[PDB]
């Protein structure tokens, strides 16, 4: 015991100023604790205002706080338990359990703020991670070790998509996985924890393959602003010290930026554009750059990205693009056609779509599919105005083929059975390319449009074609 | 003794700065010597910043201010049923003292990841369009958004009225108690409304909570929270409440007002930085508890008012992404005769079919997608180039389906009234009938089904699921009638 | 003491306010007790306003701060070629200390009105579309602009990859040293951009100044000036560099962060008044110096990222009005499959004519003409067109096809001029539009074996004889017949 004490001097919403004796201040990013009637209240030092006073941010609700109340310096950043002991557990922002299964008995804890790996620690690999999802694996294929963002305005299917990923990827994956819930719906989290148990991925009386870190929107900005790093640290630990493969699921990473937004002014910063904090770029940088494959081990991350007001050029998402190896853009226009997943086949991109990585044929199919749809998009002016009548014959066929193709890009997810009542179909990457190849050369021009919609591989196109013609 | 008391330094605009109150809590209640109550929101170093629940003519510099020692809180329990209370839960109807089973705080942690379940019970609104297209579930939060004067309140109201079906029964677990929060409404308008609730014997199972236009910004901002607690009682105690927040746009207008005057620096459109947090924490308080916790639900219908149809403005955007789906009402739709002016195109329930009744689900197979395809073909119709037998076909059905979902205000329908209508439309028995006459079809049909095949109507109801033979009887029954 | 040292009054958000340091110069680098460096930007009556280069967790109230009596400078000189540095000149690639020919301040006056000559030597990028239609001169400032993911970096990188032609040779005045300023990029990206030039043996004559996503804003603010001064070394020493700023958008964002935090007053989009002055200073430093100055040169490829195509956007406005033109990218053209995705109608080089391999300019004065008229009769692609506007659509498709070019494969001039010749003078109108792919490959390899001599004359003379025009014509008509 050599404990440092301070006193609360202000509370303004989520900002709590604390005062300490002579030059003996806890450094920025340190955690402080206040022992309250129910549990404790964690603070995080944000500035040194001067005159022995610090500005903090609260990892909880600040009501009930009394000025002049004792504050305790933990001596360092917020700590999380790490390692295999976090497997099968649910954790809140401050490395405390919320599953009521008792204390997380790990040997090490770790600071949630940490430095991002040096330029010289980086590891470039063009390896390909098969999703099972037709449009991704064909057009914008996800990279093992990569980073992978899912852009989408509200309710276009991000969370469902990401769960379809977990449904597939997270079984076939030999290693461990962290899921971070950053400012989503407490009930979504509820489902996941009950799915994990039933998929088997979690097992409360045996071995588990995943850690759960939650900080949903029912929680104040400070908390919603750090729980990403809480999760991210657990991952880091398996990457660097279990020297192995991780899968890092963040839903939804936009709320890290938003939460940053909600306290910015209270910390006394002039707003930048679209009322976002001045530190948007570097703050996102400072997090994203830790989520990374390095020589000691590999992370592969799937981050849902909220696109506010469906505006992609909104400073927040617009910044995130630079951070991802593969971008899956969900679109309202697409989803409104009943085309699930709502993936925009043109605006979706992945670095791995290069002949050197996937072969020429794959790259050629993928390019042609794109040309097709691009043409079909370009002609939608002349179709509206002068009908389908006023068209070149090649065009009439390009459109015929584009429409058939649009549909073959949809697919029943397993997760989304509640919505389609249609059984989840998973498609193999080679089966994807072959069927699109076939479609493209016209070896299927006779089959009606509906036969391609909400089915798996070309088997299912034939099966449906006949079942309907019956 | 400046620990439990302070003197006033300056007072203006609902705000009082106050020297002292040393032991005071953030968000604590204080009485002023004059009578008027207030809440501490800015415990700064020299002084405390207080929002008042009253007028301020009555507060002067130097006047002594007093610690309560409590955080804002409300009476709860089924004693509230039938009562019209202000933000702090004081009778304002005239019916005398509230009897409460206890007191909750206005801010309460939402139930965690841990004690919840899947939404699987319907909250039947009796609104054809809604109960077939965007079915709402016991536990889910569902946004009602559109411009001014579009019918937002009307949707919420027609939902409440409907619960009569179950509340006059004795099966406590089929019941749905309603809480209607009036935020920024004029008083007479809350009046005009409780009247209608009574005209429909609907007041015995509701609790209105009113923070009208004239009340203090703090009360307006608070109401939804206090209200959330009033109905949290029901959820915690094995029952199901329904909370209508009419409407959050105003709560935020007021929450903006506390902050600008407390001088906290502003966010976008002068709102505070965490105007999102404001709503998120309220709306998360709606949930459907697990068996261990009593299976109680709380269901939320927030309302939001847009301008010029813009949903991309600050607040709507915030709430739009907070809730489990929206119902968009539109003025254009309205004036051309679709009422409810629901926009199928844009309205969703993210729970979906999980909360639809099995029977309704069965005959509503694909309707919502089809209705989309219908707008599709109707947009291509504007080319006024000749139609084929496929497009004319779906146009005839979509037009009749559209028309079949129109509904008069104040008339929620039983499921078994809804089901045969939907079935008649979907399986295309309506398709050879004049469009102006579909009005008369509806009631004339129901009249006949009650009269004759009542045994079906009562099975649908009792069973909620159309067995294969019941589809038969219904199939026969419809054809029969369409030949007049 | 307080003339050479100060005391931190307060610290947060990358900024620290410090008492004293009374003798400090504006923009002097300083050092903190913990060892993190920072620079002094606001010199106020009572206090200095220092911006941090590292995490401010390192800094506490009351801490000691030391002057370094040093305006930010950087090591410069050829010992830097093939190296990957951060914005202060530090080595970030595990290759030991930089061997600096000297040091230059990050800030330097642009060469004035007097010590410049008119731009007159080509930067040959290898890209058919660019070299032929948007010719870049040495000392020029051509701006690369488009929305995200359109191809901006690819254009720059192919310029860099195309310099092997000369950099591997002997003749100094003909080589060109590459400087790639990476701003606020994912380190793994940079790593891979390195791993890409080394895969083309381009590293040996390139310099990467790296100011990655996660580094203090000052470094992201500084990097381009820092790298600017690296380029000028070559300029000032009778040599030639070219410098790619990837990107200026993100530099402006950085400058913004600093200012707002220093609570300098904001304007449009919360940028400070002198955000223009920021970029003008940068790009005015690029030039073709006059004979008296060693006739060296510095060419500039700033990257600017539009948002949904908005050229009126605050930053793009400033920058567009500083540069000598733009190479313009569009995802539309990109998904059509036209890569490089160069909008020709929107791309200009104010320098233009004067900077083109005379030979390429000889067989292409017609090219901008044809593609102009092809843009105007384009919508006629949908049954009853007269033979004139039919023909115009016949060239255009083929021509557009001819300017597609897989990544990383830039073409030698003597390899461009034949294809652009057979195109413009109507030797492809016969050929179908899908075969224009294999046409180029087979033509060039045939020209190599059976006409290596004409190719050699183009590469050497740089112009086309009346004889050479009949030579090529004959060799073409022979290949097109075959
Ligand atoms: N199904 C309906 N049929 C006919 N009129 C309706 C229907 N639903 C609502 N209205 C009418 O339209 C008017 C305004 O409806 P209202 O339910 O107040 O929408 P609102 O969005 O709440 N308007 P407000 O909140 O005052 O800006 C009322 O007079 C209703 O009578
Ligand atoms: N594959 C799918 N099939 C059918 N419906 C889907 C699919 N994906 C999404 N949806 C529908 O769209 C709704 C929203 O899905 P969801 O994944 O919650 O959107 P979201 O973009 O994650 N919402 P948010 O997290 O606020 O941005 C659901 O309720 C489904 O009806
Ligand atoms: N000529 C080309 N042929 C084929 N592919 C290309 C060509 N140019 C670019 N690409 C590809 O298209 C994608 C976009 O190119 P890129 O150089 O990243 O543009 P950018 O403006 O730098 N995108 P970013 O800066 O990351 O927002 C890359 O993934 C390349 O693989
Ligand atoms: Mg979601
Ligand atoms: Mg209303
Ligand atoms: Mg780039």
In a shared domain, residues C6 and C28: yes
Q: Which residues 370-429 of A are in CB contact (within 8 Å) with B? A: 384-385, 387, 389, 418-419, 421
E strand or H helix that includes residue C346: strand C342-349
Long-range contacts for C199-204 (Cβ within 8 Å, ≥24 apart)?
C200/C161, C200/C164, C200/C408, C201/C164, C202/C160, C202/C161, C202/C163, C202/C164, C202/C178, C203/C82, C204/C81, C204/C82, C204/C167
Nearest Cα residue to A284 out of A329, A327, A322: A322
> B: neighbours with 3+ CB pairs under 8 Å?
A
Q: Which two tokens stand for residue C149?
A: 């993911």
Contact B181, B209 (CB under 8 A): yes
The residue from B296, B329, B356 where one domain ends is B356
Interruptions in chain C after residues (C–N over 2.5 Å): 382
- For B436, the 3-state DSSP assignment is coil
Q: Which two tokens stand for residue C455?
A: 């190719």
What would you report as the CA-atom Rg of chain C, rounded to the nearest whole angstrom? 25
Q: What's the number of domains chain C is made of?
A: 3
Give residues with Cβ within 8 angstroms of B250, minimum separation 6. Answer: B183, B184, B220, B305
A51 touching B (Cβ < 8 Å): no
Q: Which two tokens stand for residue B409?
A: 């205000």
First-residue to last-residue Cα distance in chain B: 87
Number of Cβ within a 10 Å radius of residue C314? 17
**Residue A205: Cβ-neighbour burial (10 angstroms; 0-12, 13-18, 19+):** exposed
From A38's Cα to the closest Cα of chain C, the distance in A is 30
Long-range contacts for B41-44 (Cβ within 8 Å, ≥24 apart)?
B41/A13, B41/B258, B41/B262, B42/A10, B42/A11, B42/A12, B42/B262, B42/B264, B43/A10, B43/A11, B43/A12, B43/A65, B43/A67, B44/A10, B44/A12
Contact C325, C351 (CB under 8 A): yes
CA distances from B57 to A290, B20, B35 (A): 57, 22, 12
Ligand nearest to the CA of A334: 2
User: Residue B365 Cα, ligand 1 centroid: separation in angstroms?
Assistant: 30
Compute the distance between CA of residue C164 and CA of residue C157 in angstroms, rounded to an integer: 12
Q: Which atom of ligand 2 is nearest to the CA of A163?
A: 17
From C46's Cα to the closest Cα of chain A, the distance in A is 15
Cβ within 8 Å, pair A155-B348: yes
CA angle C444, C448, C454 (to 5 degrees): 100
Pocket test of ligand 1: the residue of B149, B161, B410 to mutate, having most ligand atoms within 8 Å of its CB, is B149
Residue B153 annotated as lining a ligand binding site: yes
First-residue to last-residue Cα distance in chain C: 88
CA angle B78, B79, B84 (to 5 degrees): 110
Give residues with Cβ within 8 angstroms of B63, minimum separation 6. Answer: B7, B8, B32, B33, B34
A96 touching B (Cβ < 8 Å): no
Domains of chain A: 1-77 (2.40.10.170), 78-352 (3.40.50.300), 353-470 (1.10.1140.10)
**Residue B443: Cβ-neighbour burial (10 angstroms; 0-12, 13-18, 19+):** exposed
Contact B350, A419 (CB under 8 A): no
Location of structure tokens 């002991």: A85
> A: neighbours with 3+ CB pairs under 8 Å?
B, C
Residue B149 annotated as lining a ligand binding site: yes
Mutate: best of C8, C257, C307, partner A, most A CBs <10 A: C257
Compute the distance between CA of residue C45 and CA of residue A426 in angstroms, rounded to an integer: 69
Alpha helices in C126-183 (DSSP H): 128-133, 152-161, 164-167
Q: What residues of C are labeled active site?
A: 350
E strand or H helix that includes residue C9: strand C5-12
E strand or H helix that includes residue C446: helix C436-461
The residue from B70, B92, B112 where one domain ends is B70
CATH number at residue B114: 3.40.50.300
In terms of DSSP bridges, do strands C177-183 and C206-211 run parallel, antiparallel, or are they unpaired?
Answer: parallel
Running DSSP on this structure, what letter comes out for residue B106? S
Alpha helices in B297-342 (DSSP H): 314-322, 331-335
In a shared domain, residues C417 and C366: yes
As beta bridge partners, residue A340 has none
E strand or H helix that includes residue C362: helix C358-362
Cβ within 8 Å, pair A288-C213: yes
Compute the distance between CA of residue C274 and CA of residue C267 in angstroms, rounded to an integer: 10
Compute the distance between CA of residue A182 and CA of residue C171 in angstroms, rounded to an integer: 59
Residue A158 CB–ligand 2 contact under 6 Å: yes
In a shared domain, residues B76 and B189: yes
For atom 11 of ligand 1, the residue with the nearest CA is B151
Q: How many residues does chain B have?
A: 484
Compute the distance between CA of residue B296 and CA of residue B177 in angstroms, rounded to an integer: 12
Compute the distance between CA of residue B164 and CA of residue A104 in angstroms, rounded to an integer: 50
Q: Which residues 275-334 of A are in CB contact (within 8 Å) with C? A: 278-279, 281-282, 284-286, 288-289, 292-293, 312-313, 318, 321-323, 327
Nearest Cα residue to A74 out of A106, A30, A39, A112: A30
As beta bridge partners, residue A326 has A148, A350
E strand or H helix that includes residue C459: helix C436-461
Which of B107, B276, B345 comes nearest A61 by C-beta?
B107
Residue C149 annotated as lining a ligand binding site: yes
Residue C358 annotated as lining a ligand binding site: no
In a shared domain, residues B113 and B190: yes
Compute the distance between CA of residue C427 and CA of residue C476 in angstroms, rounded to an integer: 8
Compute the distance between CA of residue C9 and CA of residue C17 in angstroms, rounded to an integer: 6
As beta bridge partners, residue A33 has A42, A72
User: Residue B160 Cα, ligand 4 centroid: separation in angstroms?
Assistant: 29
Task: Tally the C-alpha atoms within 13 A of residue A123's C-alpha that lie toward its C-beta.
Answer: 18
In a shared domain, residues C307 and C368: no
Give residues with Cβ within 8 angstroms of B127, minimum separation 6. Answer: B155, B158, B159, B340, B407, B412, B413
Compute the distance between CA of residue A25 and CA of residue A32 in angstroms, rounded to an integer: 11
Which residues make up the environment of ion ligand 5, defined by Cβ < 5 Å? B 153
In terms of DSSP bridges, do strands C143-146 and C122-123 run parallel, antiparallel, or are they unpaired?
Answer: unpaired
Compute the distance between CA of residue C401 and CA of residue C128 in angstroms, rounded to an integer: 11
Number of Cβ within a 10 Å radius of residue B62? 10
In terms of DSSP bridges, do strands C240-246 and C122-123 run parallel, antiparallel, or are they unpaired?
Answer: unpaired
In a shared domain, residues C252 and C373: no
CATH number at residue C482: 1.20.150.20
User: Residue A74 Cα, ligand 4 centroid: separation in angstroms?
Assistant: 36
As beta bridge partners, residue C301 has C244
Mutate: best of C214, C215, C336, C380, partner A, most A CBs <10 A: C214
Nearest Cα residue to B115 out of B241, B287, B242: B287
In a shared domain, residues C244 and C193: yes
Pocket test of ligand 3: the residue of A326, A346, A351 to mutate, having most ligand atoms within 8 Å of its CB, is A351
E strand intervals along C55-176: 64-71, 73-76, 83-86, 102-105, 122-123, 136-137, 143-146
Residue A175 annotated as lining a ligand binding site: no
Compute the distance between CA of residue C179 and CA of residue C192 in angstroms, rounded to an integer: 16
From A269's Cα to the closest Cα of chain C, the distance in A is 6
In a shared domain, residues B316 and B451: no
Compute the distance between CA of residue C130 and CA of residue C151 in angstroms, rounded to an integer: 13
Using CA atoms of B244, B250, B254, B255 in order, give the dihedral in degrees to the nearest 10.
60
Ligand nearest to the CA of A135: 2
Experimental method for this entry? X-ray
In a shared domain, residues B250 and B329: yes
Compute the distance between CA of residue C398 and CA of residue A293 in angstroms, rounded to an integer: 44
Closest-CA residue of chain B to A213: B113
Compute the distance between CA of residue C175 and CA of residue C109 in angstroms, rounded to an integer: 25
**Residue B58: Cβ-neighbour burial (10 angstroms; 0-12, 13-18, 19+):** middle
Q: Which two tokens stand for residue C415?
A: 């390899």
Q: Which two tokens stand for residue C244?
A: 């790619």
CA distances from C120 to B95, C285, C419, C473 (A): 94, 18, 25, 29
**Residue B44: Cβ-neighbour burial (10 angstroms; 0-12, 13-18, 19+):** middle
For residue C406, the enclosing domain spans: 357-482
E strand intervals along B165-271: 177-183, 206-211, 240-246
Residue B409 CB–ligand 1 contact under 6 Å: yes
Contact C144, C303 (CB under 8 A): yes
Resolution of this entry in Å? 3.0
Number of Cβ within a 10 Å radius of residue B64? 14
Contact A402, A433 (CB under 8 A): no
A214 touching B (Cβ < 8 Å): yes
CATH number at residue C24: 2.40.30.20
Location of structure tokens 């951070």: A323
Contact C276, C105 (CB under 8 A): no
Question: For A277, phi and psi rounded to 5 degrees?
Answer: -65, 155
- What is the SS3 string spanning chain A? CCCCEEEEEEEECCEEEEEECCCCCCCCCCEEEEECCCCEEEEEEEEEEECCEEEEEECCCCCCCECCCEEEECCCCCEEECCHHHCCCEECCCCCECCCCCCCCCCCEEECCCCCCCHHHECCCCCECCCCCHHHHHHCCCECCCEEEEEECCCCCHHHHHHHHHHHHHHHCCCEEEEEEECCCHHHHHHHHHHHHHHCCCCCCCCCCEEEEEECCCCCHHHHCCHHHHHHHHHHHHHHCCCCEEEEEEECCHHHHHHHHHHHCCCCCCCCHHHCCCCHHHHHHHHHCCCCCECCEEEEEEEEEECHHHCCCCHHHHHHHHHCCEEEEECHHHHCCCCCCCECCCCCEECCCCHHHHCHHHHHHHHHHHHHHHHHHHHHHHHHHHCCCCCCHHHHHHHHHHHHHHHHCCCCCCCCHHHHCCCCCCCCHHHHHHHHHHHHCCCCCCCCHHHHCCCCCHHHHHHHHHHHHC
In a shared domain, residues B252 and B393: no
The residue from C49, C70, C91 where one domain ends is C70
Compute the distance between CA of residue A234 and CA of residue A85 in angstroms, rounded to an integer: 10
Nearest Cα residue to B72 out of B103, B32, B112: B103
Q: Which two tokens stand for residue B81?
A: 């049923």
Q: Which two tokens stand for residue B196?
A: 């209608």
Question: For C159, phi and psi rounded to 5 degrees?
Answer: -65, -50
In a shared domain, residues B256 and B275: yes
Nearest Cα residue to A156 out of A334, A423, A312: A334
- What is the SS3 string spanning B47-86? CEEEEECCCCCCCCCCCEEEEEEEECEEEECHHHCCCEEC
DSSP labels, C314-340: HHHHHHHTTSSEEEEE-HHHHHHT-SS
Residue A261: list chain B partners with CB under 8 A: 267, 273
Cβ within 8 Å, pair A155-B321: yes
In a shared domain, residues B94 and B50: no
């Amino acid at each position: 015991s050599t404990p440092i004490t301070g006193k609360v001097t202000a509370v303004i919403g989520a900002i709590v100023d604390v005062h300490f004796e002579q030059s003996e201040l806890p450094a920025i990013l340190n955690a402080l604790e206040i022992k309250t009637p129910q549990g404790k209240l964690v603070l995080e030092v944000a500035q040194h205002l001067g005159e022995n006073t610090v500005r903090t941010i609260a990892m909880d609700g600040t009501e009930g706080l009394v000025r002049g109340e004792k504050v305790l310096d933990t001596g360092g950043p917020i700590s999380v338990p790490v390692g295999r002991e976090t497997l099968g557990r649910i954790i809140n922002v401050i490395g405390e359990p919320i599953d009521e299964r008792g204390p997380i008995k790990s040997k090490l804890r770790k600071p949630i703020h940490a430095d991002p790996p040096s330029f010289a620690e980086q590891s470039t690999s063009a390896e390909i991670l098969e999703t099972g999802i037709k449009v991704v694996d064909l057009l914008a294929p996800y990279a093992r070790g990569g980073k992978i963002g899912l852009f989408g305005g509200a309710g276009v299917g991000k969370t469902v998509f990401i769960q379809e990923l977990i449904n597939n990827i997270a079984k076939a994956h030999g290693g461990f996985s962290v899921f971070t819930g950053v400012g989503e719906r407490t009930r979504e989290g509820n489902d996941l924890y009950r799915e994990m148990k039933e998929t088997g991925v979690i097992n409360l009386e045996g071995e588990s393959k995943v850690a759960l870190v939650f900080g949903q929107m029912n929680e104040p900005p400070g908390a919603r602003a750090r729980v990403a790093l809480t999760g991210l640290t657990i991952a880091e630990y398996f990457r660097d010290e279990e020297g192995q493969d991780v899968l890092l699921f963040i839903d939804n990473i936009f709320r890290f930026t938003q939460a940053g937004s909600e306290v910015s002014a209270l910390l006394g910063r002039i707003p930048s554009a679209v009322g976002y904090q001045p530190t948007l770029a570097t703050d996102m940088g400072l997090l994203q750059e830790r989520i990374t494959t390095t020589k000691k081990g590999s992370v592969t991350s799937v981050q849902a990205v909220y696109v506010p007001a469906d505006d992609l050029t909104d400073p927040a998402p617009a910044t995130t693009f630079a951070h991802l190896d593969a971008t899956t853009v969900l679109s309202r226009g697409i989803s409104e056609l009943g085309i699930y997943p709502a993936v925009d086949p043109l605006d979706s991109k992945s670095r791995l779509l290069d002949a050197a990585v996937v072969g020429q044929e794959h790259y050629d199919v993928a390019s042609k599919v794109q040309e097709t749809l691009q043409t079909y998009k370009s002609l939608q002016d002349i179709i509206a105005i002068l009908g389908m009548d006023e068209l070149s014959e090649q065009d009439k066929l390009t459109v015929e083929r584009a429409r058939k193709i649009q549909r073959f890009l949809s697919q029943p997810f397993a997760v989304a059975e509640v919505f389609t009542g249609i059984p989840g179909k998973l498609v193999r990457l080679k089966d994807t390319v072959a069927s699109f190849k076939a479609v493209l050369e016209g070896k299927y021009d006779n089959i009606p449009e509906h036969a391609f919609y909400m089915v798996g591989g070309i088997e299912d196109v034939v099966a449906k074609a006949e079942k309907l013609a019956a | 003794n400046l620990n439990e008391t302070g003197r006033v330094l300056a007072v203006g605009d609902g705000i009082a700065r106050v020297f002292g109150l040393n032991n005071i809590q953030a968000e604590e209640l204080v009485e002023f010597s004059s009578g008027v109550k207030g809440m501490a929101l800015n415990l700064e170093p020299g002084q405390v910043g207080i929002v008042l629940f009253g007028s301020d003519r009555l507060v002067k510099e130097g006047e002594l201010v007093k610690r309560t020692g409590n955080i804002v809180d409300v009476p709860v329990g089924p004693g509230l049923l039938g009562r019209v209370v202000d933000a702090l839960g004081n009778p304002i109807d005239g019916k005398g003292p509230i009897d409460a089973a206890g007191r909750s705080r206005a801010q309460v942690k939402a139930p965690g990841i841990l004690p919840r379940r899947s939404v699987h019970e319907p909250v039947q609104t009796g609104l054809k369009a809604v109960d077939a297209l965007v079915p709402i579930g016991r536990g889910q939060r569902e946004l009602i958004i559109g411009d001014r004067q579009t019918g937002k309140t009307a949707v919420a109201l027609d939902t409440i009225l409907n619960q009569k079906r179950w509340n006059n029964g004795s099966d406590e677990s089929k019941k749905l108690y309603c809480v209607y929060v009036a935020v920024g409404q004029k008083r007479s308008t809350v009046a005009q409304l409780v009247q209608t609730l009574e005209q429909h014997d609907a007041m015995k199972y509701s609790i209105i909570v009113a923070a009208t236009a004239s009340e203090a910004a703090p009360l307006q901002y608070l109401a939804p929270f206090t209200a959330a607690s009033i109905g949290e009682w029901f959820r915690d105690n094995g029952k199901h409440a329904l909370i209508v927040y009419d409407d959050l746009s105003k709560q935020a207008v007021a929450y903006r007002q506390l902050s600008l005057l407390l001088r906290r620096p502003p966010g976008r459109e002068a709102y505070p930085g965490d105007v999102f947090y404001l709503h998120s924490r309220l709306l998360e308080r709606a949930a459907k508890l697990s068996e261990k916790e009593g299976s109680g639900s709380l269901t939320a219908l927030p309302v939001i008012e847009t301008q010029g149809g813009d949903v991309s403005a600050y607040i709507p955007t915030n709430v739009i992404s907070i809730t489990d789906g929206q119902i968009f009402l539109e003025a254009e739709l309205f004036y051309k005769g679709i009422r409810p002016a629901i926009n199928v195109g844009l309205s969703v329930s993210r729970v979906g079919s999980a909360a639809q009744v099995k029977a309704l689900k069965q005959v509503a197979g694909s309707l919502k997608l089809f209705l989309a395809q219908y707008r599709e073909v109707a947009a291509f119709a504007q080319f006024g180039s000749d139609l084929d037998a496929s497009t004319k076909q779906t146009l005839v059905r979509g037009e009749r389906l559209t028309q079949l979902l129109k509904q008069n205000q104040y008339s929620p329908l039983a499921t078994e009234e809804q089901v045969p209508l939907i079935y008649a439309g979907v399986n295309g028995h309506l398709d050879g009938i004049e469009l102006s006459r579909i009005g008369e079809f509806e009631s004339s049909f129901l009249s006949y089904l009650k009269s004759n095949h009542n045994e079906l109507l009562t099975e649908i109801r009792e069973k909620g699921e159309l067995s294969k033979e019941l589809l038969a009887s219904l199939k026969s029954a419809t054809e029969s009638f369409v030949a007049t």
